[PDB]
Tab-separated table of C-alpha atoms and ligand atoms in Angstrom:
chain	number	residue	atom	x	y	z
V	1	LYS	CA	58.360	88.232	159.023
V	2	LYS	CA	58.855	89.191	155.485
V	3	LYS	CA	61.622	88.284	153.496
V	4	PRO	CA	64.121	91.273	152.625
V	5	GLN	CA	64.321	92.392	148.669
V	6	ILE	CA	66.722	94.163	146.888
V	7	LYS	CA	66.168	96.589	143.788
V	8	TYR	CA	68.087	98.385	141.520
V	9	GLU	CA	66.869	100.688	138.491
V	10	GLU	CA	68.264	98.508	135.525
V	11	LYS	CA	67.647	101.723	132.936
V	12	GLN	CA	70.716	103.086	134.626
V	13	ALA	CA	74.237	101.964	133.828
V	14	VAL	CA	77.236	102.200	136.109
V	15	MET	CA	79.727	104.134	134.161
V	16	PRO	CA	83.136	104.854	136.360
V	17	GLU	CA	85.761	107.130	134.632
V	18	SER	CA	88.553	105.699	132.733
V	19	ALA	CA	91.068	106.411	135.556
V	20	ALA	CA	91.763	103.637	137.927
V	21	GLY	CA	90.111	103.504	141.265
V	22	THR	CA	87.302	101.678	143.494
V	23	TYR	CA	83.931	102.954	142.032
V	24	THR	CA	80.499	102.234	143.674
V	25	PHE	CA	76.758	102.218	143.039
V	26	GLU	CA	73.717	101.842	145.196
V	27	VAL	CA	71.195	99.112	145.599
V	28	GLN	CA	67.930	99.637	147.465
V	29	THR	CA	67.191	97.178	150.189
V	30	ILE	CA	63.590	96.556	150.833
V	31	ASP	CA	62.093	95.149	154.102
V	32	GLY	CA	65.349	94.927	155.810
V	33	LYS	CA	69.034	93.471	154.524
V	34	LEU	CA	68.629	90.760	152.355
V	35	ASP	CA	71.908	88.181	152.784
V	36	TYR	CA	73.331	88.071	149.181
V	37	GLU	CA	76.466	88.134	147.441
V	38	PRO	CA	77.465	90.200	144.337
V	39	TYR	CA	79.377	88.665	141.135
V	40	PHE	CA	80.769	89.613	138.031
V	41	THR	CA	79.281	87.328	135.234
V	42	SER	CA	82.755	86.831	133.933
V	43	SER	CA	85.357	86.164	136.180
V	44	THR	CA	88.555	86.318	134.024
V	45	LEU	CA	88.208	90.291	132.911
V	46	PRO	CA	91.632	91.694	133.207
V	47	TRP	CA	90.777	95.231	133.909
V	48	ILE	CA	88.624	94.607	137.152
V	49	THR	CA	90.726	93.534	140.248
V	50	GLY	CA	88.568	90.787	142.173
V	51	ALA	CA	84.882	90.371	143.085
V	52	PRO	CA	82.675	93.178	143.962
V	53	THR	CA	81.581	93.693	147.589
V	54	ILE	CA	79.163	95.133	149.646
V	55	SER	CA	81.307	98.173	151.242
V	56	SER	CA	78.700	99.533	153.325
V	57	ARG	CA	75.165	98.481	154.867
V	58	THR	CA	75.012	101.313	157.414
V	59	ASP	CA	71.728	102.854	155.688
V	60	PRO	CA	68.621	100.971	156.328
V	61	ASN	CA	67.417	101.804	152.731
V	62	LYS	CA	70.482	100.942	150.512
V	63	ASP	CA	73.793	98.813	150.420
V	64	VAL	CA	76.918	100.372	148.744
V	65	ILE	CA	78.699	98.082	146.222
V	66	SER	CA	82.103	98.520	145.402
V	67	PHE	CA	84.605	97.044	142.633
V	68	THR	CA	88.047	98.040	141.415
V	69	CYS	CA	89.204	98.848	137.917
V	70	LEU	CA	92.376	99.559	136.368
V	71	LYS	CA	92.971	102.311	134.082
V	72	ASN	CA	91.094	101.943	130.775
V	73	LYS	CA	94.046	103.061	128.454
V	74	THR	CA	91.986	102.399	125.234
V	75	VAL	CA	89.504	104.674	123.092
V	76	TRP	CA	86.709	102.342	123.717
V	77	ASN	CA	83.965	101.858	126.329
V	78	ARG	CA	84.180	98.329	128.069
V	79	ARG	CA	81.434	96.334	129.635
V	80	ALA	CA	80.968	94.233	132.667
V	81	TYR	CA	78.017	92.846	134.441
V	82	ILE	CA	77.208	91.975	138.039
V	83	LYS	CA	74.530	89.475	139.215
V	84	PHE	CA	73.451	88.779	142.889
V	85	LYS	CA	73.190	85.305	144.474
V	86	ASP	CA	70.681	84.830	147.425
V	87	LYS	CA	73.408	83.151	150.090
V	88	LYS	CA	70.555	81.043	151.377
V	89	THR	CA	68.687	79.891	148.580
V	90	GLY	CA	71.738	79.789	146.009
V	91	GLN	CA	69.525	81.158	143.438
V	92	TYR	CA	70.128	84.611	141.451
V	93	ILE	CA	68.023	87.395	142.524
V	94	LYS	CA	65.098	88.680	140.107
V	95	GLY	CA	64.871	91.902	138.563
V	96	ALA	CA	61.717	94.240	138.691
V	97	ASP	CA	59.911	92.024	136.240
V	98	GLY	CA	60.379	88.928	138.527
V	99	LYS	CA	61.674	86.881	135.595
V	100	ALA	CA	65.068	88.167	134.504
V	101	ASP	CA	67.950	87.961	136.902
V	102	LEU	CA	69.111	91.161	138.369
V	103	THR	CA	71.987	92.349	136.130
V	104	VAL	CA	73.973	95.786	136.719
V	105	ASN	CA	75.382	96.937	133.539
V	106	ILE	CA	78.978	98.281	134.303
V	107	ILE	CA	80.508	100.473	131.490
V	108	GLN	CA	83.721	102.192	132.102
V	109	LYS	CA	84.411	105.069	130.087
V	110	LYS	CA	86.902	105.415	127.478
V	111	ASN	CA	90.246	107.260	127.623
V	112	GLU	CA	89.782	110.531	126.410
V	113	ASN	CA	93.496	111.252	126.287
V	114	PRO	CA	95.038	108.195	124.778
V	115	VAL	CA	98.825	108.120	123.706
V	116	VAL	CA	99.084	106.630	120.324
V	117	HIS	CA	101.745	105.131	118.458
V	118	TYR	CA	102.090	104.133	114.633
V	119	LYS	CA	103.599	101.597	112.535
V	120	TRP	CA	104.211	102.408	108.704
V	121	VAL	CA	104.936	100.025	105.718
V	122	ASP	CA	108.711	99.842	105.472
V	123	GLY	CA	110.410	102.392	103.162
V	124	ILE	CA	107.477	104.944	102.749
V	125	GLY	CA	108.835	107.276	105.709
V	126	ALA	CA	106.151	108.777	108.009
V	127	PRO	CA	103.766	111.859	107.899
V	128	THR	CA	105.206	115.135	109.263
V	129	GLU	CA	102.630	117.055	111.224
V	130	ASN	CA	102.273	119.488	108.289
V	131	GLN	CA	101.025	116.592	106.169
V	132	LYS	CA	98.458	115.528	108.385
V	133	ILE	CA	94.958	116.876	107.784
V	134	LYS	CA	92.333	116.655	110.308
V	135	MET	CA	88.699	115.795	109.297
V	136	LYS	CA	85.156	117.556	109.637
V	137	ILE	CA	82.337	115.670	110.776
V	138	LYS	CA	79.807	115.045	108.142
V	139	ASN	CA	75.788	114.959	108.337
V	140	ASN	CA	74.038	113.146	105.241
V	141	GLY	CA	77.260	114.536	103.107
V	142	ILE	CA	76.997	118.058	104.307
V	143	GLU	CA	80.084	119.111	106.433
V	144	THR	CA	79.240	120.498	109.801
V	145	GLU	CA	81.287	122.921	111.924
V	146	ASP	CA	82.857	120.056	114.238
V	147	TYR	CA	85.875	118.153	113.652
V	148	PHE	CA	87.228	114.679	114.697
V	149	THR	CA	89.323	115.416	117.735
V	150	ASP	CA	90.995	111.881	118.150
V	151	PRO	CA	94.597	112.189	117.389
V	152	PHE	CA	94.848	109.347	114.931
V	153	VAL	CA	92.009	110.725	112.942
V	154	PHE	CA	94.046	112.552	110.182
V	155	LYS	CA	94.595	112.226	106.193
V	156	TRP	CA	98.004	111.521	105.159
V	157	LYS	CA	98.323	114.268	102.250
V	158	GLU	CA	100.066	113.348	99.339
V	159	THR	CA	103.028	115.951	98.571
V	160	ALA	CA	106.416	115.983	96.451
V	161	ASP	CA	107.956	114.588	99.490
V	162	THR	CA	105.823	111.659	100.560
V	163	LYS	CA	106.556	108.011	99.408
V	164	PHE	CA	103.476	106.127	99.506
V	165	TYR	CA	101.437	105.707	96.467
V	166	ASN	CA	97.631	106.063	95.743
V	167	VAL	CA	96.589	105.498	92.175
V	168	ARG	CA	92.985	107.136	91.655
V	169	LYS	CA	90.212	105.718	89.478
V	170	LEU	CA	89.834	108.166	86.381
V	171	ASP	CA	86.233	106.928	86.092
V	172	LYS	CA	85.510	108.225	89.697
V	173	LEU	CA	87.484	111.303	89.065
V	174	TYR	CA	86.199	112.368	85.852
V	175	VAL	CA	83.614	115.499	85.808
V	176	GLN	CA	81.555	115.161	82.788
V	177	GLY	CA	81.845	118.483	81.019
V	178	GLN	CA	84.650	119.920	82.980
V	179	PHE	CA	87.525	117.321	82.302
V	180	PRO	CA	89.405	117.014	79.067
V	181	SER	CA	87.915	114.647	76.142
V	182	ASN	CA	91.204	112.799	75.819
V	183	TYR	CA	91.106	112.159	79.861
V	184	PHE	CA	91.309	108.348	79.259
V	185	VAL	CA	93.933	108.025	76.474
V	186	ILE	CA	96.888	105.900	77.224
V	187	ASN	CA	99.896	105.891	74.718
V	188	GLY	CA	100.523	101.725	74.732
V	189	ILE	CA	103.600	99.993	74.593
V	190	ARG	CA	103.544	99.866	70.542
V	191	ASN	CA	102.663	103.563	71.009
V	192	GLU	CA	99.105	102.542	70.405
V	193	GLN	CA	96.230	104.942	71.459
V	194	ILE	CA	93.773	103.072	74.104
V	195	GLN	CA	90.840	104.628	75.776
V	196	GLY	CA	91.300	102.812	79.188
V	197	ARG	CA	88.453	102.696	81.830
V	198	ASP	CA	88.872	101.500	85.307
V	199	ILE	CA	85.331	101.715	87.170
V	200	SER	CA	85.759	98.383	88.800
V	201	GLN	CA	89.548	97.911	88.792
V	202	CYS	CA	89.915	98.670	92.744
V	203	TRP	CA	91.948	94.829	92.744
V	204	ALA	CA	94.299	96.606	90.082
V	205	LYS	CA	94.864	99.750	91.654
V	206	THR	CA	95.864	98.248	95.057
V	207	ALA	CA	98.060	95.780	93.132
V	208	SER	CA	99.722	99.014	91.410
V	209	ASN	CA	100.278	100.796	94.613
V	210	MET	CA	101.915	97.716	96.039
V	211	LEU	CA	104.019	97.314	92.961
V	212	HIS	CA	105.177	100.671	92.712
V	213	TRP	CA	106.356	100.277	96.381
V	214	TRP	CA	108.029	96.847	95.455
V	215	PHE	CA	109.801	98.436	92.180
V	216	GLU	CA	111.165	101.031	94.507
V	217	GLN	CA	112.170	98.844	97.221
V	218	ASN	CA	113.898	96.543	94.678
V	219	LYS	CA	115.258	99.314	92.341
V	220	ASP	CA	118.908	98.196	92.498
V	221	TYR	CA	118.307	94.497	91.906
V	222	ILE	CA	115.853	95.524	89.064
V	223	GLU	CA	118.735	97.560	87.625
V	224	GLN	CA	121.057	94.617	87.719
V	225	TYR	CA	118.318	92.556	86.211
V	226	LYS	CA	118.021	94.956	83.049
V	227	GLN	CA	121.804	94.639	82.649
V	228	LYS	CA	121.940	90.946	83.184
V	229	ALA	CA	118.976	89.242	82.041
V	230	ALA	CA	117.875	88.683	78.382
V	231	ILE	CA	114.909	90.866	78.431
V	232	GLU	CA	112.236	90.095	76.036
V	233	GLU	CA	112.008	92.784	73.292
V	234	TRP	CA	108.218	93.757	73.870
V	235	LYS	CA	108.742	94.219	77.418
V	236	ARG	CA	111.575	96.607	77.560
V	237	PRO	CA	109.944	99.613	78.330
V	238	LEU	CA	108.059	98.042	81.455
V	239	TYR	CA	111.306	97.575	83.528
V	240	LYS	CA	110.721	100.763	85.525
V	241	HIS	CA	108.082	102.647	87.523
V	242	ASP	CA	107.186	106.339	87.113
V	243	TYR	CA	104.841	107.956	89.828
V	244	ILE	CA	104.539	111.610	89.224
V	245	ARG	CA	103.295	113.733	92.329
V	246	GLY	CA	101.561	116.998	92.069
V	247	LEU	CA	99.381	116.517	89.077
V	248	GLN	CA	95.859	118.031	89.081
V	249	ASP	CA	92.865	115.598	88.989
V	250	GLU	CA	92.636	116.276	85.238
V	251	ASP	CA	96.090	114.580	84.604
V	252	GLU	CA	95.615	111.449	86.560
V	253	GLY	CA	95.968	109.575	83.375
V	254	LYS	CA	99.736	110.814	83.284
V	255	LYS	CA	100.467	109.894	86.713
V	256	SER	CA	101.349	106.027	86.900
V	257	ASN	CA	102.853	103.822	84.125
V	258	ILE	CA	101.929	100.578	86.388
V	259	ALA	CA	98.416	101.495	86.873
V	260	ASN	CA	98.094	102.625	83.222
V	261	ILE	CA	99.192	98.996	82.142
V	262	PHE	CA	96.422	97.284	84.058
V	263	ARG	CA	93.948	99.970	82.564
V	264	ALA	CA	94.897	99.619	79.025
V	265	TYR	CA	95.500	95.989	78.998
V	266	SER	CA	93.894	94.022	81.800
V	267	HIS	CA	89.973	93.777	82.531
V	268	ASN	CA	87.264	95.834	84.030
V	269	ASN	CA	84.801	93.032	84.989
V	270	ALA	CA	82.031	94.506	87.041
V	271	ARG	CA	82.266	91.458	89.532
V	272	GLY	CA	85.577	92.849	90.234
V	273	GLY	CA	89.034	90.975	90.533
V	274	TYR	CA	91.727	89.786	93.140
V	275	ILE	CA	94.748	91.779	94.268
V	276	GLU	CA	97.046	88.483	94.123
V	277	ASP	CA	95.719	88.063	90.404
V	278	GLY	CA	97.348	91.227	89.337
V	279	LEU	CA	100.251	90.843	91.491
V	280	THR	CA	101.073	87.570	89.965
V	281	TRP	CA	100.305	88.742	86.183
V	282	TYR	CA	102.999	91.505	86.490
V	283	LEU	CA	105.762	89.664	88.166
V	284	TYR	CA	105.838	85.898	86.829
V	285	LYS	CA	104.170	83.173	84.934
V	286	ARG	CA	100.967	81.167	86.411
V	287	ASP	CA	98.448	79.325	84.356
V	288	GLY	CA	95.636	80.742	86.118
V	289	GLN	CA	96.261	84.462	84.778
V	290	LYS	CA	96.825	83.330	81.495
V	291	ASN	CA	93.571	85.404	80.340
V	292	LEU	CA	93.907	88.304	83.024
V	293	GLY	CA	94.576	90.824	80.050
V	294	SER	CA	95.505	91.000	76.363
V	295	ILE	CA	99.372	90.698	77.378
V	296	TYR	CA	101.252	88.996	80.005
V	297	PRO	CA	104.085	91.068	81.651
V	298	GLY	CA	105.370	88.386	84.004
V	299	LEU	CA	108.588	90.497	84.364
V	300	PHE	CA	110.662	88.686	86.421
V	301	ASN	CA	109.740	84.975	85.676
V	302	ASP	CA	113.036	83.386	86.217
V	303	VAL	CA	113.716	85.038	89.740
V	304	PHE	CA	110.338	83.689	90.997
V	305	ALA	CA	109.565	80.627	89.043
V	306	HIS	CA	110.421	77.540	91.017
V	307	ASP	CA	110.777	79.255	94.529
V	308	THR	CA	108.890	81.086	97.133
V	309	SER	CA	106.183	83.536	95.649
V	310	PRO	CA	106.410	86.916	97.326
V	311	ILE	CA	103.029	87.066	97.385
V	312	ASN	CA	100.763	85.713	100.080
V	313	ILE	CA	97.012	85.785	100.871
V	314	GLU	CA	95.827	85.364	104.648
V	315	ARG	CA	92.545	85.407	106.085
V	316	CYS	CA	91.283	86.854	109.245
V	317	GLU	CA	88.020	86.695	111.178
V	318	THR	CA	89.094	87.321	114.920
V	319	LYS	CA	90.835	90.533	116.623
V	320	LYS	CA	93.631	88.093	117.301
V	321	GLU	CA	93.881	87.001	113.932
V	322	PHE	CA	93.674	90.553	112.435
V	323	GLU	CA	96.177	91.825	114.845
V	324	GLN	CA	98.860	89.032	114.519
V	325	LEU	CA	98.585	89.204	110.815
V	326	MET	CA	98.832	93.001	110.557
V	327	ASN	CA	102.053	92.997	112.949
V	328	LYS	CA	103.576	90.232	111.012
V	329	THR	CA	103.198	92.077	107.785
V	330	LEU	CA	104.387	95.207	108.982
V	331	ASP	CA	107.499	93.880	111.023
V	332	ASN	CA	108.378	91.784	107.899
V	333	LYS	CA	108.399	95.028	105.660
V	334	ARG	CA	105.721	93.765	103.165
V	335	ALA	CA	103.138	95.850	101.570
V	336	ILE	CA	99.437	95.107	102.360
V	337	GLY	CA	96.016	94.771	100.440
V	338	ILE	CA	93.092	94.587	102.109
V	339	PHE	CA	90.255	92.715	100.606
V	340	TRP	CA	86.447	91.775	101.370
V	341	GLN	CA	83.429	90.626	99.730
V	342	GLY	CA	80.602	92.987	99.251
V	343	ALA	CA	81.839	91.609	94.129
V	344	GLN	CA	85.382	91.629	95.552
V	345	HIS	CA	86.626	95.044	96.911
V	346	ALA	CA	90.261	95.837	97.444
V	347	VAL	CA	92.174	98.732	98.914
V	348	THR	CA	95.757	99.445	99.902
V	349	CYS	CA	96.742	100.064	103.781
V	350	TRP	CA	100.070	101.865	104.260
V	351	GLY	CA	100.026	101.880	108.199
V	352	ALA	CA	98.117	101.449	111.508
V	353	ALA	CA	97.469	103.388	114.897
V	354	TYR	CA	97.840	101.651	118.207
V	355	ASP	CA	96.905	102.516	121.773
V	356	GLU	CA	98.762	101.893	124.935
V	357	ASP	CA	97.356	98.530	125.088
V	358	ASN	CA	98.805	97.914	121.504
V	359	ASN	CA	95.111	97.205	119.936
V	360	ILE	CA	95.069	98.462	116.278
V	361	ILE	CA	92.677	101.464	116.547
V	362	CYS	CA	93.109	102.988	113.057
V	363	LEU	CA	94.175	101.919	109.761
V	364	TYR	CA	95.683	104.387	106.607
V	365	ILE	CA	94.151	103.509	103.377
V	366	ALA	CA	94.675	104.504	99.757
V	367	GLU	CA	91.049	104.387	98.583
V	368	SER	CA	91.251	104.543	94.939
V	369	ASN	CA	87.407	105.356	94.883
V	370	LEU	CA	87.815	108.267	97.060
V	371	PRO	CA	88.674	111.879	95.436
V	372	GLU	CA	91.299	113.550	97.438
V	373	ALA	CA	94.855	112.621	97.114
V	374	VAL	CA	95.559	111.503	100.427
V	375	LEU	CA	95.473	108.388	102.498
V	376	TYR	CA	92.236	108.270	104.549
V	377	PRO	CA	91.907	106.922	107.963
V	378	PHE	CA	89.705	104.045	108.511
V	379	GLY	CA	88.788	103.443	112.299
V	380	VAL	CA	89.055	99.709	113.480
V	381	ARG	CA	86.387	98.138	115.929
V	382	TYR	CA	85.825	94.642	117.060
V	383	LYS	CA	82.268	92.854	117.375
V	384	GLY	CA	81.327	92.121	121.079
V	385	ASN	CA	83.378	91.879	124.116
V	386	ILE	CA	87.255	91.843	123.297
V	387	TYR	CA	88.236	91.002	126.992
V	388	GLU	CA	85.836	87.809	127.002
V	389	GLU	CA	84.107	85.613	121.822
V	390	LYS	CA	86.085	85.719	118.823
V	391	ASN	CA	85.421	89.679	117.774
V	392	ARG	CA	85.076	90.001	114.168
V	393	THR	CA	87.286	92.813	112.884
V	394	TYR	CA	85.732	95.611	111.278
V	395	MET	CA	86.552	99.159	109.692
V	396	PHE	CA	84.720	102.065	108.794
V	397	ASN	CA	85.321	105.195	106.475
V	398	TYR	CA	85.612	108.607	108.758
V	399	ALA	CA	84.909	110.429	105.537
V	400	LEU	CA	81.358	109.566	105.418
V	401	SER	CA	78.381	110.269	107.397
V	402	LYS	CA	76.865	106.860	108.614
V	403	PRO	CA	79.985	104.573	107.386
V	404	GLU	CA	79.013	100.839	106.699
V	405	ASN	CA	80.832	98.529	108.789
V	406	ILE	CA	83.335	96.649	106.481
V	407	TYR	CA	84.054	93.239	107.754
V	408	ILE	CA	87.769	92.530	106.563
V	409	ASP	CA	87.943	89.081	105.232
V	410	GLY	CA	91.685	89.135	104.759
V	411	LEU	CA	95.162	90.593	103.581
V	412	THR	CA	97.204	90.027	100.474
V	413	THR	CA	100.732	90.962	100.855
V	414	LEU	CA	103.677	91.534	98.750
V	415	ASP	CA	107.461	90.582	100.010
V	416	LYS	CA	110.241	92.251	98.610
V	417	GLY	CA	111.508	88.806	97.689
V	418	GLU	CA	115.035	89.495	99.030
V	419	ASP	CA	116.559	85.952	99.026
V	420	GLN	CA	114.906	85.184	95.658
V	421	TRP	CA	116.675	88.127	94.215
V	422	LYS	CA	119.982	87.171	96.012
V	423	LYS	CA	119.738	83.517	94.393
V	424	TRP	CA	119.085	84.856	90.976
V	425	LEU	CA	122.008	87.344	91.311
V	426	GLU	CA	124.594	84.771	92.734
V	427	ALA	CA	123.487	82.464	90.000
V	428	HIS	CA	124.533	85.115	87.478
V	429	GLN	CA	127.983	85.874	88.792
V	430	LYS	CA	128.550	81.776	88.963
V	431	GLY	CA	127.706	81.623	85.357
V	432	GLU	CA	130.193	84.258	84.587
X	501	CL	CL1	83.312	87.917	140.694
X	502	CL	CL1	111.415	105.254	104.958
């Protein structure tokens, strides 16, 4: 009397649709019906209801195995694995090579009609349908005829009516032999003429974007500061922000006073810099930033001197860390710099897309290296099995063929600093 066996073609994954339901696959039963039990290799997966079962043995050549899935609301495939235990010997049944355990790969397909919602940084409004620009798929830099069709894949075009900031690197926009020869000339504080270059100033572009937002959100406090504080003479022109929308690429040097300050007076170290250094430099006096540039604005030093800094630096390396930190930042009305080592790189993030499970699926990025006057979408993905594992967050550039995985190291955030402003104002009215 031979011992029965079971076989399965492991080259074949079992791929149920995204819909909820009880799905099946077949296992071939050789020389009779082996007494075994199927098991998921992880029992704690929330999108599978219970253990798999043998739902039919009536065909002498095959068993039917059933398992039940919840609907996959996410835009990602999700994976599970079934192994088989010999009920008499207690051993796992072997696969075709006689060495590895027989393992059936389950991959539930992604939701093709997801309901997406969005969260934007406080105070910048939100894109209208006319401001959302769909994107073509590229192959080795050449655009194809196809488009990315996921609803969250769009560029947020800058118009006269939009309220985000995206200062771009002149050194990248510059077209040698087409742009004017005075393209990099800045009129400085003492009206001196300066040729400012910014090829490695992504930390400063991100800082400038966040400071434009901060000056706008705190416009009224800043007006009271100019009326009430004893302003240092040389700093008087710096107590405003100008960001002029609708300029051609050739006029980018005339677009932003804050960006121009960094470009005229800070540094362009090829190694890079840090978002938080540029933010501190602009806002209050700290010894670490003493030699960041040839001047030190430190414009509101007596508002933030001996109190909470509105600047924070937070690291993330798991999916849970990334989502908690993004949600905390967005829900607390703060602006967002994203950094990573790769040289230290930096971009600005103005919002995020979410699926119906509230996973973050896309970020909307001001990328000072990219040419268009838009925010670009960066898809968000996580290493490994998000249902089991830390799941290192990473993002990627939809605008590129074969985008490199960008492992986010952390966020640098800028708070409005309302309590510090109120205390400064209250202290003034008390000294009346
Ligand atoms: Cl199980
Ligand atoms: Cl708003």
